[PDB]
Amino acid sequence: MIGVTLFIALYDYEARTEDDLTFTKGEKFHILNNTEGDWWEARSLSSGKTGCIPSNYVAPVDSLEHHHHHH
C-alpha cells in the first residue's frame, strides 16, 4: 500500500515483557507508534498480533530491495 512503509525483521526476538512481540527474521511489520524511540509498537503481518519490537531489529523493506529505473 502506497504511503505505508513495510518493515522486515533482521533478527529473531523473544518477547521480554507482556506487551512485546515475538518474531523471526524475515517477519513483516507495519509500525503503529514510534514514540518510545528504542521500542516501537507494531502489528505483525504474519500473526496479526500487535506489540512492541526493538526499533534496531527492523529495517524498511525498500531499503534492502534492488532498484532499477525502468518499470
* Residue spans per domain, the chain: 1-71
Q: Provide the terminal-to-terminal Cα distance of the chain, rounded to the nearest Å.
A: 18
Resolution number, Å: 1.9
Evaluate the CA torsion angle 53, 54, 57, 62 in order and state its sign.
Answer: positive
DSSP string, 15-71: --STTBPPB-TT-EEEEEE-TTSSEEEEEETTT--EEEEEGGGEEEHHHHS---S--
In angstroms, rounded to a whole number, what is the distance separating the alpha carbons of residues 59 and 37?
A: 14
